[PDB]
Amino acid sequence: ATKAVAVLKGDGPVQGIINFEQKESNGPVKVWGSIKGLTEGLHGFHVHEEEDNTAGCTSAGPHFNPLSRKHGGPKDEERHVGDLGNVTADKDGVADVSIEDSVISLSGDHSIIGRTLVVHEKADDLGKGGNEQSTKTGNAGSRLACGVIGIAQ
């Protein structure tokens, strides 16, 4: 029913294409996309904003979500939101995604509509080792693109 779209764009090359489909009356939102520009490697996951009080894309809370709390993943502390850790490109950066979130919802209590999908300009290296950097982001946090997820026809 809800067919959202998010044409990555920012840095310049990063022209990923993420679309949100939910052809279900009681099913999760089939989230899947494909990046274009990155390079075969690791790149921080979307949903990562240190600070901001001006709003450049959206506006809700430039401090992640209280659902994930922390990057989580190997420690598993919550990561109930769109904060997993890091992904991986194909053989030319082309990073594709494919997940199904049901707990969340395009709109309502858990309105996901407004997720500034961006890519990090660095490799979290699945952890830098220290704390207070890679635990929240990936010792880099470099926002560029802004593939905001919005309803489309």
Catalytic residue among 48, 79, 115, 124: 48
Is 41 exposed, middle or buried, given 0-12, 13-18 or 19+ CB atoms closer than 10 A?
Answer: middle
Q: Are 31 and 96 in contact (CB under 8 A)?
A: no
Token output for 89: 């490109």
Q: How far is CA 87 from CA 125, 136, 144, 150, in A?
A: 10, 15, 16, 22
Catalytic residue among 43, 79, 115, 143: 143
Among residues 67, 86, 69, the alpha carbon closest in space to that of 140 is found at 86
- φ and ψ of 30, to 5 deg: -70, 100
Binding-site residues for Zn(2+), in ranges, read: 63, 71, 80, 83
Q: Catalytic annotation on 43?
A: no
Binding-site residues, in ranges, read: 46, 48, 63, 71, 80, 83, 120
Beta bridge partners of 21: 3, 30
Q: How was this structure determined?
A: NMR
Binding-site residues for Cu cation, in ranges, read: 46, 48, 63, 120
Domain architecture of the chain: domains with CATH: 1-153 (2.60.40.200)
Residue 49 has a CB neighbour count (10 Å cut-off) of 18
Token output for 53: 């009080």
Q: Catalytic annotation on 110?
A: no
- How far apart (Å, rounded) are the C-alpha atoms in residues 47 and 26? 25
Beta bridge partners of 101: 29
Handedness of CA 31, 32, 34, 40 (dihedral sign): positive
